Amino acid sequence: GTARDILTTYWQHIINHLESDNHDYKIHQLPLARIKKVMKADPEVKMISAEAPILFAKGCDIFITELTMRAWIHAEDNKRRTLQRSDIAAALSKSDMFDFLIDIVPR
Amino acid sequence: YVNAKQFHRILKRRVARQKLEEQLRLRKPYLHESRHNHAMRRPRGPGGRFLTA
Amino acid sequence: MKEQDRWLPIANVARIMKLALPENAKIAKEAKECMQECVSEFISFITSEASEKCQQEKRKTVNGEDILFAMTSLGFENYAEALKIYLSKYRE
DNA sequence: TTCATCATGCATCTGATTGGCGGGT
DNA sequence: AAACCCGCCAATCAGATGCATGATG
Ligand SMILES: O=S([O-])[O-]
């Protein structure tokens, strides 16, 4: 049950919880109205489906969790129990999936 | 080295964020003056923790 | 359109981070802010891709499958395919 | 024509925002 | 040593949610 071991099985657990636990499609960790406001921030975006922020609510939950666990691995390796910004910056550089954040988290 | 799948969309977003900085031209220590005041005004324990009236 | 409409609330982001870490763990305020900025761009980045596809196809509504298609196109196939299972449940 | 589903405005009320201190980093 | 800084607490009120309406395709 090491940090790298829970990251290795991460998507196995995500899919298990998706397939088993009975979801609440109103109650989320993130508010749907703010997700929609972020989408509406783009001038090109016109109308948004009710389903879209709901997908982003779960997607962003998975995203924050995955990146936090990646950043935590870098914190453990420096024997710190406080997660720093540099731990997140280190995690982004380990996968090209995070290249879209190049301008958000420089260096 | 750039994610070929994300290259076009990254530069589309960079231009889009540049417009939005130009438009929103005007982070802060606090967002709201009313909530800042509430917290400052509020009674605290000796430890600095907020408490009930 | 307010200027804080771009970002999700920091407390909600910080709670998800807290749940992802061991009970004893601490999170720097810059790490909370950095994560808030990252996850907000995640939404904007994907939504922009879905948005432009809807424009070329003369559709006004950015719908659920447009988000999944965009996620696959941009290399979030794990997110696209996981949320496809989640979507079929919601519709069920 | 009808149906499914969007934005908008409004009422209700809820949880995000908030900072001084101490002890762990 | 000695800076540095994040979890702890709960009340106000910015805003999230949910419903009615009209628009849209
Ligand atoms: O090289 S980055 O700017 O796509």
Residue numbers in the entry:
A (entry chain C): 58 to 164
B (entry chain A): 234 to 259, 264 to 290
C (entry chain B): 39 to 130
From the paper:
The core version of the CBC is a heterotrimer of the subunits HapB, HapC, and HapE that binds the CCAAT box, a promoter element present in about 30% of all eukaryotic genes. The two histone-like subunits HapC and HapE associate with the DNA backbone and bend it in a nucleosome-like manner, whereas HapB with its sensor helix αS and its C-terminal anchor inserts into the minor groove and recognizes the CCAAT box. Depending on the target gene and other transcriptional regulators, the CBC hereby either activates or inhibits gene expression. Recently, a pan-azole–resistant clinical Aspergillus fumigatus isolate was identified to carry the mutation P88L in subunit HapE of the CCAAT-binding complex (CBC), a conserved eukaryotic transcription factor.
To investigate how the P88L mutation in HapE alters the DNA-binding capacity of the CBC and ultimately confers drug resistance, we attempted the crystallization of wt and mutant CBC from A. fumigatus. Structures of the Afu_CBC could be solved in complex with double-stranded 23-bp-long DNA fragments derived from the promoter sequences of either cycA (2.6 Å resolution) or cccA (2.3 Å resolution). In addition to our previously determined An_CBC–cycA crystal structure, we also obtained data on the An_CBC in complex with the cccA DNA fragment (2.2 Å resolution). Superpositions of the Afu_CBC–cycA and the Afu_CBC–cccA complexes as well as the corresponding A. nidulans proteins indicated high structural similarity, suggesting that complex arrangement and DNA bending are uniform among these species and independent of the nucleic acid sequence and the target gene promoter site (root-mean-square deviation [rmsd] 0.153 Å for A. fumigatus, 0.246 Å for A. nidulans, 0.306 Å for cycA, and 0.369 Å for cccA complexes; Fig S2A). As visualized by the wt Afu_CBC–cccA and wt Afu_CBC–cycA complex structures, these conserved amino acid variations cause a slight shift of the N-terminal αN helix of HapE that might enhance mobility and prevent crystallization in the absence of a high-affinity DNA ligand. Likewise, in the absence of nucleic acid, Afu_CBC did not crystallize.
